[model samples]
Target chain A: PVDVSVSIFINKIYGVNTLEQTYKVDGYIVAQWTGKPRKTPGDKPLIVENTQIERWINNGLWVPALEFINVVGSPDTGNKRLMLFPDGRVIYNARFLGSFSNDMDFRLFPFDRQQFVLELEPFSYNNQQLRFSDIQVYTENADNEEIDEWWIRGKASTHISDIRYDHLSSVQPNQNEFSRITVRIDAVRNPSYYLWSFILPLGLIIAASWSVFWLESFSERLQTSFTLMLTVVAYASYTSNILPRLPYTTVIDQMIIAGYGSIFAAILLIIFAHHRQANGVEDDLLIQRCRLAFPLGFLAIGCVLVI
Target chain B: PVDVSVSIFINKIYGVNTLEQTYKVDGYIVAQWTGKPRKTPGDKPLIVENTQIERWINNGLWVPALEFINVVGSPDTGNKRLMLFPDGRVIYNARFLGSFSNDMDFRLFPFDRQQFVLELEPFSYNNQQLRFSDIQVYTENADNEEIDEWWIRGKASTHISDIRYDHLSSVQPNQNEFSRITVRIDAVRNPSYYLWSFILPLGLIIAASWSVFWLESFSERLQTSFTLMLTVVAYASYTSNILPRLPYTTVIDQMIIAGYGSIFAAILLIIFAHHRQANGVEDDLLIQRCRLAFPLGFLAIGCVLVI
Candidate 1:
């Protein structure tokens, strides 16, 4: 078995599409192996670039198909190079831009944590024929990423294990396990834009929704609540406009629902205080003056809903 | 360049996962082109299958990579065959399962219509070129489909166009245009489940939210509205739970915002009737009796927002 040492240098990893459950990664891969001992021309390392690699292919060279198992499609390969030494060590380096597929779990969005993963494995060779000696990942989390959405955490984490294929590849009847290299990068949402732009404004609307209780008269309270309600809807519309369509509700969505509920409940009680009269129970002044009660009440209930 | 005739037979096009913005397609592809006349065992379309095709490749036989341009990953290739004829016609057939990528515009989500597409183009060679003689699609829609979420509309649509690439190829630096075959399958959403399950329940909650105006007293009205407010939040949570995440709101999301607005408007109008004493004339019962007025009023405003 030939042992191949691989190193991955991630240049830029951006474009995480939540709706598509996909991410784009641009990186360079270096794979080195000990080839048949041969002679070299120069004292410096011999470098054969792009078009010249075809000559090497024509001349007998064993290049294993080390494919990205999780790659969505074929990787857009660029700048392929082959380096040879007098002692027979051969290094192949190539830059690739690929969209990789990860089985992502997005149940907790907007403030959810995530890990972008990439899997590399030999295509046709089994573990007995090919083995991975070492794998290295060189990527920093946020290298002055001011405009990027995801704030990458620590450097990339990695795993080397054998993956068992559950299904038969061809008409073969046996399960197969291949040596795989898995890279994981931890990341968290920046949440600044969402917190200030989405959550803060949303909180203000919900908070203001209760302010209708402070109106000069019942009429003002009723009239302005309508406007407040409209405002909340407008805010929600703005929020939903930017959010990708998800089947599940996020923290932002829940907050919007609370805004609606708070105002609706306020509407219900405002009318009930004056009309309910089977007995001579006149309206109490304290009941109408729930400025603190309404605001704190919604807050208490809102907090309790999570409980 | 060879004149290749390509035909695709779609078997089961299922598993349209909205969350992933992905669709799966299983099919058979057949490509035929005329080559130099060769000797064959019999004139009966010499069928050489699977493992033997590599022998011809070893002899420097060229096979064009007819790729599904929109495909997300490399297709799960199944059986492959090469049929050589006594005449100059050679046919290649293969079965593939591919997860194709298309920029699906799902803005109008809930009732939005969509057309699944497949774009077929030669990967390397441009026109001067490989030309598609004929193509066909074999998928039947609404064939007693009880579980499919989308309903197939009309017959499949096809377009033969020359697509230009903005990048350089190995041989040239100029822009290249290649013959591309585009296939489109039209579909409409079966919104029945969502309408009844999501919209219906949401409507009931909003309708029940209006019951605040019917409370026994002003206090009752105010207090019950809170629960109704909470109910809307709960319903929103439920609705958001099942939706695949996207970057924007859909028709259902708009309805949710409107629901909040409708209830908030009711609160405003309810309070306004009790407090507005512009003329110092005591309360007018007619003003407070607008229990139905605000509900319908919000609806009118709601309709105008989308329009």
Candidate 2:
């Protein structure tokens, strides 16, 4: 079995569709294999164009069919070239843009760090019978600054493993194992946008909510609290609009809920003061001054629910 | 140009992924067309299995590639058969399950009405047009009784349209039109569970939130309101846990926000009745009594937001 070494260069990985479980990857794929010596016209490396490659295929040249197992559809390849060396080696290079599938867990919405993966395998070849000896991934950032929505260490990792399918056209189903190449890149979400845009405004709104307690009259205070409630819900609406849904809640969403809870608790207290005592106006002075105590108490409880 | 009249019998449609903009469709695809009459030993319809279908492929049979343009990956086909009748007409049938892609807008979420569509077109042949006169949607539920999460109207609509693709490598790019078969099934989401479970509890919590205004002391009203605030937050957390992220706020979510606003307004009044007078207790009587005026006031403003 001849070894077909593989390498990938990362250009840009953006366009993430959480609902489809797919991410767009734009990059170059390189595969190299050594062949029998043949007389060439040039002393240096020879570059064969796309049209000449078909002639080579017609002339009984071996072309490996490496398929992306996790790819959603066929890749739109951009460029194709054959790099023929002075020695008995040939390299096939192609640039492709495809949507690669992955099992992404977005439970941690605003501050989620994820690993984007791509699985490559020979379509009809079994493990020991035909294999990729080593699959390598090479990626570099322009300096060390953040270039994309997610930031990695600016490096990638690779793993070569055997995948077995239990159900197939059954005679020797166990023999249907194939070698798979797994490439992974770890990325951390840039939460600054969500922080300044999502969290900061929410914090201001919650703080303003505390001011409903400081209004001039019962009418002003009670009426003002309703607006405060609407504010928190509006922010939640805005956040949810930009963010995708998860099976669980997020830290930002919890913050909005906390704002709602504290405001509701304040409402409970307000109504309790007027009606709970059968119209008792005495000792209301002591009860009125106690609004200062809850900011810390409510905030601590809200923060505790986040992690 | 062979006019291929097609029909789709939808068995089950489930697993709607809001993020991916895709849905799982399990159904049978039938394609019937006329061919030369064949001589058989018996008059019964010929039932060809998967193995015998390949045998027909080897014997120069034309199997039109009717592909679902929106399908995410290759479909999982279960059973395949070719019904050869006494006449020249043939019925090609196959059972398939595929994750079909669509541009599904879920901004309305719980109360959204949507049309699930399937676009079928011949992959290789542009001259062989696909015509869908009828797309029989066999949904077994009583008239308009609820079935599962969605309440689909027990009828389907079909349309025959010509689709033009300009990116193809063709000499007559203007005339490169392909006949596409479009199938549509209208569905409406049942918001009952969310109303009773999610919104009702939240409504009760918000309605009861104003009782803090009835408390005997100012401190009692203000402090207890904090607990009410926390309750709304907890309910919001419960909602976010079960619900996927949506592009906009639903009616239920709007009610939750109103709950927060009213509670916060009550807090302002309870605190204001005590502190606004500069230790003057006589004006506090009028302010405390103003709570009676707010129940209708808050309700009207909150209700105005749904439309």
Candidate 3:
């Protein structure tokens, strides 16, 4: 078995899709392998660039094809190079832009943890032939939080392992096993934008809704509650209209639901206070004075929800 | 004169501050120059790393110190390396994290264009002693838009020029003249967060404030206007609290002021309709039916403000 050393340099990671379960990656790939030494011009390494690499491959140079197992469609390849050393070594380098697939959970959105992954395997060779010996992944910064939409946690995590398939084209000794390389980069959502612009405003809206209880007349209290209900609904629609849609509920979605529940509960309480029959049409003062109670109660429940 | 070639690799640009007119930059600096040929162990390039480079400098190795003119204070330096070749070529490489200053205008924030700049000049040596021949700046990607906070427009714009100081201590000819390397990276704010989270919600709030006119009766109309006014004020405070402080009003700030004016104008008009009666306390029907008129009027005026 021939050992191949693989290294990937990730330039950028963007265009994360929730529904498609994909993310765009721009990077460079380098694969090194020991080959039989050959005569070169002036005994120096021979360089094959871009289009010339295809020419060399067509001529008789043996070059292995490595495929991205999880990439969607095809990658947009940029530059390609081959460095043939007089000493028995060959290095293949190329730049690629691809959309890779992964299982991403955004249930705690605005504070979600995501991992971008890449899977690489030999196109035709099994572990008995061309096996991966080592893999190195280089991201921009291994330290410091980002000021962007996503904050990268640390350096890229890498693994090179053999995958044995139960079913294959031919059954032979170790023929079903294939060498694979997996790279993972963990990141977290920067939360600042959503924290200030979405959550805070929604909080203000929910707190203001409780102000309906402070109104003097039953007509004012009842009418204002309806407007507050509409406000919550409008906010819910606004939130849904902007944020990326998911199958399950997010933090913001849950907050909107809580808002609707709070307003509806207030409407029911307002109506209940008016018809409690302590005296005919006399409003209950205890229930009417729940302006502070509702806000505190909602806050406590919100904490519980997060916990 | 010594001709030095400078190259910079920008890893990250973040922590943009409007009030302080500052931004943080993380990158690597490489300067190459030709000195006299030196003896080596095996005629290969001799690598001097980290602390050894300082020792080399102390041992009379002529290494020029380049300073960042716009940097706030001292920079956080990382790995330093000196690659000295047998053929007299020397390459100095070091990583640095710095807070740089720029004249940033955030009046059109969320849609503003910004330029991150770095000025490199020799600290002690003038142009006669050390000159910058060319500069190469390598940012992550030069041709793609980012999914981050700021979208980098293109590759780094570079300039190598000679600057003459008016006053200096040295009396020799051209002693005050120095060489400088300036690198500029243009970027635009990714307005997605602000457009969806801040502007859209604010637009809804302003539009909803106009709903006060649709309320029946003079008391309902007048009373609702005050609540709308409070809502706008609260929103303004929230916006001001979160956004980076600036001397001039931003687009969001102006929108907040417009919200205040709209609600205040409605309050006056609501009161005026009751008083400006044909008989006694009979609201003017023409003025009362300005529910649609106010929204259209605000929209037209808003267009003028932007123009």
Give the interface RMSD of candidate 3.
Answer: 12.2
Question: In model 1 chain A, where is the ten-residue run with the lowest total lDDT?
Answer: A166-175
Per-residue alpha-carbon lDDT of candidate 3 for residues A214-250, written as tens digits (9 for 90 to 100): 8998768766865785677567656765778543456
Q: By DockQ, who's the top model here?
A: 1
Q: Under the 3 Å rule for N, CA and C atoms, how many clashes does model 1 have?
A: 49
DockQ, in order, for the candidates? 0.07, 0.06, 0.01
Interface CA RMSD, all predictions: 9.1, 9.8, 12.2
lDDT digits (tens) for residues A197-277 of candidate 1: 888888878876777766666555554565565566556656666875543456777777777677767766666654564
Deviation in Å, model 1, residue B261 alpha carbon: 16
Native interface contacts retained, candidate 1: 0.01
Q: Between candidates 1 and 3, which one is better according to lDDT?
A: 3
Put down candidate 2 lDDT per residue, A109-162, tens digits, no spaces. 678877788898865446754668787797755554344577665378888988
Better of 1 and 3 by DockQ: 1
Best by the lDDT measure: 3
Count clashes in each candidate, considering only residues at least 3 apart in sequence or on different chains: 49, 43, 0
Taking chain A of candidate 3, what TM-score results? 0.96
Model 2: lDDT of residue B218: 70
